[PDB]
């Protein structure tokens, strides 16, 4: 088997999202820029390492790549590649705008092409089963579009960012009903439970993208999106003992994207002098949770329980 | 069996919502305040009586309480307690702001805790079944959040009201698809048919909460929400002979919350000089329907067919 | 077997929608008015012919009419009559406002009554099956409401137009989740595949109606709706070889309404100096595709493969 699962890209993804969240606090906190730089450098290094490993997988393990691509449930994790590329481009935009733009456009084209080729192929039917409605399906249809929207808005194409953000938002509102119904009805196998953290992602990722597109102006839509995001956060907080029933694992990084988007939208809200205490608590909670995830990952690396 | 079903709290709920709807007409009609006071006093008295009965149930009939709480379909009716508490607090806010604030906060905390503890356990799966997707599921996930949003906005916490309103709105949009699909596919047993009136609730409750949060400004969102609410109202009007196929019962109070929210949003629309004729018709229709419900309830009390 | 299927009304519907799309370009081009006039006259003539055919069907083949109406899947195509009536009224509004208003009101009342009588009757259940969740269900619940909203906004009743637009939009958001889940799970049979083009309709029809109601002001909602519409457009472009797996047929006119709404919203966007290149490409693509559909229909008529 391939040592690095395609789902391990959540590590650089979460680190990059938290790096941007810290970057948003440059003016208010002098060491915020240094913390963001450290997080972004670590995320970029990890992403480069994982991209080299995945290129090796394509060169020598193409059978596994095709098996995961054609699998109706495991294909969604391939969307973590363009998302992480877009986030790393967002990070590099603070230093070298040209390479940042190149990475952002490569990631946008890659994720859009992947969604067009695969997510649309499911409509043929037969391969997608009622038991394949997993939270990981958000990544190609929802998370990728939101990340592309935010990245493009960062480059100055707000209208295109609005298009991508709307695609992501409506895809999320269109897929979540069936996902939650399946979770209520068919439960979820213990191995796939850790991916439930992605249910926290779309609500906060959407508001983060919206605040990035419209210059961080806190509309009514941003407040509504936080309302739903915090409802989902409470639901998943009550369920965490059930999610980790079989013990902690690297699969808990699925919460990383949601927590980092929560932190970013929290900085956006605090800048706007709206719900300041809630924003501070959300930022602290997300940072502490991602720090615990980092500590757990380092522990797993030390004990060798990281790679497969 | 306990003489008072948990679903009988719709009586004080509907009466309180209609009381607030009338209250919103303080300046236009001199007798609106008197009518609102009478309705609110009756609703508060009935709510106090029912709360005493439910405390008795907890003290002596805790097995039934545990059975309904753990039931995947009957748990949603326990959410009528905090909703009625918040509505009674809204009523009392006209007389005793401190007691009203206390009741509103108790109701908000109670409903949020109930949704966190129960509506999220369903995601574990195995207890919720495709035949348990009933209209009553709106109460803990949708109606409670909207009522908390409106109550908080009445206290002055608009941003928190916006958060709760968004939670409720997105929960409604996420749950209605599967609910309507189940209704189309699996029908609904005659005993649970009267609860179909809750399908009317979310569309009008959402617009009522929105108009309460934003100072009763008739935005485009309010018009859209009335569009959907009136579509659902026509759908349920065409189905009423089917809903009461087995005869009228106290379960028809499920329409009470929807009709009262329709009346409240109608007052809000009329104040804003938007669709005055439609607003007048909606207000009259809601008042007449709730009056018919009150007459039916009084007749059942006289006949002795009210308590179980 | 009546020669003209009820689903052939998409021809006058698509032609009329494209006629309005061209009509929106009077001032920019000199020949736009002439092209719109030609398209509208052809659409009106075809609609009159089809309405005479359907009146003949009702007078002599009422059994087929009653069979399609009571069929849970074939009933949705009866909604093409009021939709095409409203579109033809929109066309005639440029020449004779009184007859245009009469046609728009007749179509609005007809579609609303049909949705109330039939779409609501499904909630009784037992006739609608999980395999009856076809894309054609958009027509009575979604497309009709949007067309009524746009036509009413043309007459000057913006608030009523907003009500109808909101009804249609929320109905679309509430139905699409289960429709897409059904498409993913169970393959659409080859004969029903051509109707997949209706999946492209709601996203663009919604934005067209929104831009018509609000005087063609490109709002954030319009950009979001284009985002989703273009996502669906790419999904269906990737699937087209599968949709026509068994050969081209008149059922491909299902794409006509979506493409015409695309063209209309493209004119609206270009007028507003928003994404001019994307708008031009969308307009050209929609016009070319509808022209190809027209050529295919002409060839089928020449070969005698049009009527049943």
UniProtKB/Swiss-Prot annotation, chains A, B, C:
Give UniProt keywords alphabetically. Antibiotic resistance, Cell inner membrane, Cell membrane, Ion channel, Ion transport, Membrane, Tellurium resistance, Transmembrane, Transmembrane helix, Transport
Q: What is the effect of changing residue 257 to L/V?
A: No ion flux while channel is in closed conformation
- Report how it sits in the membrane: Multi-pass membrane protein
Cytoplasmic topology: which positions?
Answer: 55-74, 123-134, 186-189, 244-249, 303-308
Whether Ion transport counts among this entry's keywords is yes
> Which biological processes are named by the entry's GO terms?
response to antibiotic; response to tellurium ion
What are the TM regions of this chain, as residue ranges?
3-23, 31-54, 75-93, 97-122, 135-155, 158-185, 190-213, 220-243, 250-270, 276-302
Q: Where is this site: Important for gating?
A: 257
What molecular functions are annotated in GO for this chain?
identical protein binding; monoatomic cation efflux transmembrane transporter activity
Which subcellular locations apply to this protein? Cell inner membrane
Identify the InterPro entries for this entry.
Answer: SLAC1/Mae1/Ssu1/TehA (IPR004695), TehA (IPR039264), TehA/Mae1 (IPR011552), Tellurite_res_ion_channel (IPR052951), Voltage-dep_anion_channel_sf (IPR038665)
Q: Which ranges of this chain reside in the Periplasmic compartment per its record?
A: 24-30, 94-96, 156-157, 214-219, 271-275
One of this protein's Pfam families, by short name?
Answer: SLAC1
Coiled coil, from the record: none
User: GO CC terms on record?
Assistant: plasma membrane
Its biological purpose is as follows: Ion channel involved in potassium tellurite resistance.
The family annotation for this protein states:
Belongs to the tellurite-resistance/dicarboxylate transporter (TDT) family.
What quaternary structure, including any partners, is listed in this protein's UniProt entry?
Homotrimer. Each subunit forms a channel.
The name this protein goes by in its record: Tellurite resistance protein TehA homolog
Q: What is the lineage of its organism?
A: Bacteria, Pseudomonadati, Pseudomonadota, Gammaproteobacteria, Pasteurellales
Gene that encodes the chain: tehA
